[PDB]
């Protein structure tokens, strides 16, 4: 559906998980597999302010 | 009237965001006033009627 | 028991000490050891500025705005030694010989060529026949109306080294006006107060105020000869021309007799250029010249960013 | 020969602080460390009748 | 007279010297009222002490 509906951008402490997710990422993001996904380009991929 | 003098505090009352509030600020984007107080009221004692 | 106050100076000192840029690297050539030490510092700085490997080697964290200087050489008759620094000047093109003189022109010189302010201009220039010799086809170029194509704006002058016949002149072309001799002391730009029309007040919800206000320049062939006018406006390049034509309409009505039905080369009423941009919400300042016969009131404007434009036809 | 000149300086400050004024009895003064970050704040009174 | 002495005063640029004090001790002198002799006696009548 729409990109940003419930996506929170806030900087949480994320867990580093071992399994690999990168496979088929951009294609499944473009066709629309999962709803409420957010893409951020290199200028906007940082820890947000508080 | 021969007083020409009062007495007041010399430094401001400090308030700082501790960790217990910092987690809520980071995740939920809200900070409570002196979380220690609400925790001593809610979780520690069952009644503690005011 | 002092209060200690409400704000702390340690924070201010620290953050400002962080804000100061590192010093320029002097290189000491006269003494050997100082030279060697500065060269060592230079190689360390290049190692510190170009290696993606480390992070402290990343220095880009936290503008170059002098003007572009252009030097012109002119005869000592076609320029008063006393004329103030920063007056916008306009240039002319010679056909074969250009190295002899450039023949750069001043607004009072244009007022003289075109025929109070008259008396001031004569007290600057009593015998301005050299002025007629600089443009041989003045009487031809008023009619051919090609006069604006050759008068190219040069803008404010900074310095003029004074010689017997030739004059050395430094002119701001693009960028903010600034000097050179010192840590770049600033200048301002002067235009006579008469023969200048404020087109933001000529027609005077609430009209909006932009950040930047521009100065235009226009050249009009009336039956009383040609004349030049500079306009302090702010609205837009698409509206200043319309408002200017509305302004000139009473002077345009007179040109029915002079125009030629057969030859269409004379019809243009004038052209408009944009010289530069200055701060709005301020206004300008009033001063008189300090010369021997000085009676002209003059507007002078701060914060001039010289961005010259071309002549655009209006009619 | 180069001439070095001296020209004297004066300051017209006066020591002034907020708590030493009496107005400071009107308010109650707390120092918040990071106030620019706080977006909004509110107080919620509950009054029984 | 108090209005008169308030109209002046202020700050001085030099700000260096020590000022005359009363010999008994205490406050340093603020200013000088130069008058004639008759106004002097009448001011001593209106102002004793």
Please write down the HEC assignment for all residues of chain C: CCCCCCCCHHHHHHHHHHHCCCCCCCCCCCCHHHHHHHHHHHHHHHHHHCCCCCCCCCCCCCCCCCCCEEEEEEECCCCCCCCCCCCEEEECCCCCCCCCCCCCECHHHHHHHHCCHHHHHHHHCCCCHHHHHHCCCHHHHCCCCCHHHHCEEEEEEEEEEECCCEEEEEEECEEECECCCCCCCECCEEEECCCEECCCCCCCCCCCCCCEEEEEEEEEEECCEEEEEEEEECCCHHHHHHHHHHHHHHHHHHHHCCCCCCCCCCCCCEEEEEEEEEECCCCCEEEECCCCCCCCEEEEECCCEEECCCCEEEC
Question: Are B and D close enough to touch, i.e. 3+ CB pairs under 8 angstroms?
Answer: yes
Which of the residues C4, C5, C9 would you substitute to probe the D interface, choosing the one with the greatest number of D C-beta atoms within 10 Å? Answer: C5
Reported resolution, Å: 4.0
Contact D31 B6 (CB under 8 A): no
Q: Are C288 and C297 spatial neighbours (Cβ–Cβ below 8 Å)?
A: yes
In angstroms, rounded to a whole number, what is the distance separating the alpha carbons of residues C179 and C188? 11
Q: Which two tokens stand for residue C53?
A: 């490997």
Measured between CA atoms, how close is B35 to chain A, in angstroms? 18
- Determine the 3-state secondary structure of B13 from DSSP: strand
Whole-angstrom distance, CA of residue C135 vs CA of residue C92:
8
Question: Is residue C275 within 8 Å of residue C155, measured between CB atoms?
Answer: yes
C3 touches chain D (CB under 8 A): yes
| Distance, CA of E42 to CA of C203 (rounded, Å) | 70
A15 to A18, A40, B36, C285: CA distances (angstroms): 10, 19, 28, 65
Q: Return the structure tokens found at C76.
A: 């000592």
- The Cα–Cα gap between C298 and C88 comes to 13
Instruction: Report whether C277 contacts C264 (CB < 8 A).
Output: no
Dist CA D12 CA A31 (whole Å):
72
Residue contact D34–B10, C-beta within 8 A: no
Question: Are C93 and C150 in contact, with CB atoms under 8 Å apart?
Answer: yes
What is the DSSP pairing of strand D30-32 with strand B13-15?
parallel
Neighbours of chain E (3+ CB pairs under 8 A): D
Q: Report the alpha-carbon distance of residue C155 to residue B5 in Å, rounded.
A: 67
Distance CA(C150)–CA(C171), nearest Å, equals: 18
Please list every residue in chain E whose beta carbon sits closer than 8 Å to the beta carbon of residue D10: 13, 15
CB-based burial, E6-44: b 16+ in 10 Å, e otherwise:
eeeeeeeeeeeeeeeeeeeeeeeeeeeeeeeeeeeeeee
Three-state DSSP at B42 gives helix
Structural biology method used:
cryo-EM
Q: What are phi and psi of B24, to 5 degrees?
A: -70, -35
Q: Nearest by CB to B8, which of D24, D30, D33?
A: D24
Choose among E41, E23, E20: nearest CA to E32. E20
Tokens linked to C260: 């030629």
Chains A and C touch (3+ CB pairs under 8 A): no
From B6, B9, B15, residue closest to D32, measured CB to CB: B15
The packing angle between helices C117-124 and C107-114, to 10°, is: 100
């Amino acid at each position: 559906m729409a990109s940003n509906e419930g996506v929170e951008n806030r900087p949480f402490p994320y867990l580093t998980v071992d399994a690999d997710l990168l496979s088929n990422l951009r294609q499944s993001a473009a066709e629309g597999l999962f709803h409420s996904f957010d893409l951020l380009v290199g200028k906007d991929a940082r820890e947000a302010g508080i | 009237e021969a007083d020409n003098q009062i007495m007041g505090p010399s430094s401001y009352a400090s308030f700082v965001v501790r960790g217990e509030n910092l987690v809520t600020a980071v995740s939920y984007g809200r900070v409570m006033r002196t979380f220690e107080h609400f925790m001593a009221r809610i979780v520690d004692s069952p009644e503690k009627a005011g | 028991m002092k209060v200690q106050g409400s704000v702390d100076r340690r924070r201010l000192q620290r953050r400002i000490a962080g804000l100061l840029p590192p010093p320029a690297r002097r290189l000491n050539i006269s003494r050997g050891s100082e030279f060697t030490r500065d060269v060592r510092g230079l190689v360390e700085e290049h190692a510190q500025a170009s290696s993606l490997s480390a992070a402290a080697v990343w220095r880009a964290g936290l503008g170059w705005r002098p003007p572009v200087f252009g030097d012109f050489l002119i005869h000592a008759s076609s320029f008063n030694n006393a004329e103030a620094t920063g007056t916008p000047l306009f240039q002319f093109k010679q056909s074969d010989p250009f190295s002899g003189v450039d023949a750069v022109f001043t607004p009072l010189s244009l007022f003289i060529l075109m025929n109070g302010l008259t008396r001031m201009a004569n007290l600057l220039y009593d015998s301005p026949a050299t002025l007629a010799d600089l443009v041989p086809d003045f009487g031809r170029l008023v009619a051919d109306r090609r006069f604006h194509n050759f008068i190219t704006p040069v803008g404010p002058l900074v310095e003029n080294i004074k010689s017997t016949y030739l004059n050395k002149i430094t002119t701001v072309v693009h960028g903010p006006v600034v000097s050179k001799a010192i840590p770049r002391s600033t200048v301002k730009v002067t235009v006579p107060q008469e023969a200048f029309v404020d087109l933001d007040a000529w027609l005077s919800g609430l009209q909006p105020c932009p950040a930047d206000a521009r100065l235009y320049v226009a050249l009009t062939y009336e039956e009383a000869g040609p004349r030049f006018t500079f306009f302090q406006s702010s609205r837009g390049h698409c509206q200043i021309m319309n408002i200017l034509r509305i302004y000139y309409s009473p002077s345009i009505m007179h040109r029915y007799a002079v125009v030629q039905p057969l030859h269409i080369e004379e019809l243009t009423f004038g052209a408009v250029a944009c010289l530069g941009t200055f701060s709005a919400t301020d206004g300008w300042r009033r001063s008189a010249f300090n010369y021997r016969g000085s009676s002209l009131p003059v507007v002078e404007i701060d914060s001039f960013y010289s961005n010259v434009s071309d002549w655009e036809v209006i009619l | 020969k180069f001439e070095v000149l001296l020209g004297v300086y004066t300051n017209a400050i006066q020591y002034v602080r907020f708590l030493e004024t009496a107005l400071a009895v009107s308010c109650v003064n707390t120092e918040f460390k990071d106030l620019s970050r706080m977006t909004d704040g509110k107080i919620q009174f509950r009054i029984s009748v | 007279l108090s209005e008169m002495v308030a109209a002046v005063s202020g700050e001085s640029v030099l700000k260096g010297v020590s000022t005359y004090t009363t010999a008994k001790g205490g406050e340093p002198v603020g200013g000088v009222f130069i008058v004639t002799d008759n106004v002097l006696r009448q001011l001593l009548t209106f102002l004793g002490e």
